[PDB]
Amino acid sequence: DCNSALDQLLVLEKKTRQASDLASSKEVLAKIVDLLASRNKWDDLNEQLTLLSKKHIQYMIQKVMEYLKSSKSLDLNTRISVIETIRVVTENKIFVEVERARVTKDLVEIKKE
Known part of the structure; x- marks a missing residue:
């Protein structure tokens, strides 16, 4: 059911108003x-x-996005996925603060080595 029950929960993600939207x-x-x-x-x-x-x-x-290797079943899947995460987060240049960089250590060296 949860596979089908996920949709009506993801719907209200369409907007952010109160702190009930950050609890959502x-x-x-x-x-x-x-x-x-x-x-x-x-x-x-x-x-x-x-x-x-x-x-x-x-x-x-x-x-x-922290959950990448917190609980990741396959290393191969992680490579291209993380490549897409950094790939998307390049632009605004605000990031790399801590988390992106520390997944670039892991991603770069672990992915291929």
């Missing part, structure tokens, strides 16, 4: 990430994120 951001952005973890559904999640990232809450996204 917490819970929904954790479950979406969570759905990815159980059956390697995160591929959608990288893609899901790009769609969601196309919708643009930077530090709201910092934690959700």
Whole structure:
């Protein structure tokens, strides 16, 4: 059911008003990430994120992109996905603060070595 039950939860992500939208951001952005973890559904999640990232809450996204190797089933999948995460986060130049750089260590050296 949860695979179908995810949609009506992701809908209200369409906008941000009160702190109930950042609590909805917490819970929904954790479950979406969570759905990815159980059956390697995160591929959608990288893609899901790009769609969601196309919708643009930077530090709201910092934690959700943190999950890369926190709980990653396959190393190969991570390479190109992370390549897409840095790939998308290049532009504004505000990032690389901590988290992007520390996933560039991991991504660059671990991905290929």
